[PDB]
Amino acid sequence: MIVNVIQKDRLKEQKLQFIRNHQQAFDVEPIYPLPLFEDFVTSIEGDCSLEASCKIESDKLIASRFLLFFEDKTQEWQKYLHQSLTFFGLVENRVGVKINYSLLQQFLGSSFDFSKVTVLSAGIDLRNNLAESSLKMHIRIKDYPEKLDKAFALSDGAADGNYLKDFVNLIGFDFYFNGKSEIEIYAEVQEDDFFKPEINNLVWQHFPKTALQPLKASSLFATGLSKANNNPVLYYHLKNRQDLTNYFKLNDTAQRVHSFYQHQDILPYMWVGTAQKELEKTRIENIRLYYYKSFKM
């Protein structure tokens, strides 16, 4: 019992330190309402992972971006959904905003099979303009084609064709503080399929050569489709975060983020998100960088 007590206190502080390391590196003052997210993270006592990320827009650095991934092996997905939504309601109460839950509600419908969930995450992207701040949720589903159909319908034309359903597992939800909400569909290709002729025909031939080059360093490729996106966002799951500079031509702001994270006590892998047009340039100006740490008893 005493071992569990010590460990619970240790993991609580480690999670807060990971959040604070990120915040303190990039934002001299924490963006409100970060402490509410910190309270939520604290309240999750089982095994989890945290994502800390930066969104670079030329010299603009957006860094109050965090996600918690529920990773307790009990697979209690409905419990985790309700914990996340409790946090969302707490945000509504403290900040004095009303969130638009309609895309999530329609996706879940009235008979959601939680045994088909493989990933659930919840978090924040906080801004100095309240209206531009958002809460975030992602749900990954497996063998649930009914829900893929619904997500594509909810996309309002963003999720291009029905051939993409073959590639979709993760569904994302953004909930802006102004009551605007968005859905995102992520079409993915796993590393084991990169060299298959079917993938060259359905996927690779519709991309320029520059979009294919980082695949060499990636375990997974994805494209994020949403009407909130100006362009489709290409995502690369780099096996080793040290390979970022070898495959992506970074501007000064992104290099700053890269440099900070090289020697932090974090997981080896990362995600990189960028528009197709950025990879055609001599230097990327718009990029998202996502880093990870796990917390296990």
Ligand X SMILES: CC(C)=CCC/C(C)=C/COP(=O)(O)OP(=O)(O)O
Our CB check for ligand X shows the closer of 160 and 188 to be 188
CA dihedral 75, 134, 16, 31 (to 10 degrees): 180
Give me Rg for the CA atoms of the chain. 19
Q: What are phi and psi of 109, to 5 degrees?
A: 60, -155
Task: Tell me if 36 sits within 8 A of 87, measured CB to CB.
Answer: yes
The first and second tokens of residue 158, run together, are: 């963003």
Least separation in angstroms between CB 173 and ligand X? 9
Our CB check for ligand X shows the closer of 83 and 274 to be 274
Least separation in angstroms between CB 170 and ligand X? 4
Binding residues among 182-201 for Mg ion as defined by CB under 5 A:
184
Residues that bind ligand X (CB under 6 A): 55, 125, 136, 170, 172, 184, 186, 188, 220, 222, 224, 235, 271, 273, 288, 290
Least separation in angstroms between CB 282 and ligand X? 24
In a 10 Å sphere around its CB, with 0-12 CB exposed, 13-18 middle and 19+ buried, how is residue 186 labelled? Answer: buried
Our CB check for ligand X shows the closer of 33 and 224 to be 224
CB atoms within 10 A of CB 245: 14
Our CB check for Mg ion shows the closer of 11 and 185 to be 185
Residue written as token pair 């801004």? 127
Contact range with Mg ion by CB under 5 A, out of 50-58, 143-151, 180-188, 204-212: 180-188
Q: What are phi and psi of 29, to 5 degrees?
A: -110, 130
Least separation in angstroms between CB 246 and ligand X? 19
Our CB check for Mg ion shows the closer of 51 and 184 to be 184
Task: Tell me if 250 sits within 8 A of 284, measured CB to CB.
Answer: yes
Our CB check for ligand X shows the closer of 36 and 63 to be 63
The answer to whether the annotation marks 13 as part of a ligand binding site is no
Least separation in angstroms between CB 268 and ligand X? 16
Task: Tell me if 46 sits within 8 A of 74, measured CB to CB.
Answer: yes
> Which residue's Cβ lies closest to Mg ion?
184
Contact range with Mg ion by CB under 5 A, out of 112-120, 177-185, 214-222, 264-272: 177-185
290 binds, among Mg ion, ligand X, none (CB under 5 to 8 A by kind): ligand X
In one-letter notation, the amino acid at residue 242 is Q
Least separation in angstroms between CB 256 and ligand X? 18
Least separation in angstroms between CB 184 and ligand X? 5
Interface size with Mg ion, residues (CB under 5 A):
1
Contact range with Mg ion by CB under 5 A, out of 54-62, 129-137, 178-186, 246-254: 178-186
Our CB check for Mg ion shows the closer of 100 and 264 to be 100
The residues of the shown chain that bind Mg ion, judged by CB under 5 A, are 184
Annotated binding residues, written as ranges, equal 184
The annotated binding site for Mg(2+) is made up of: 184
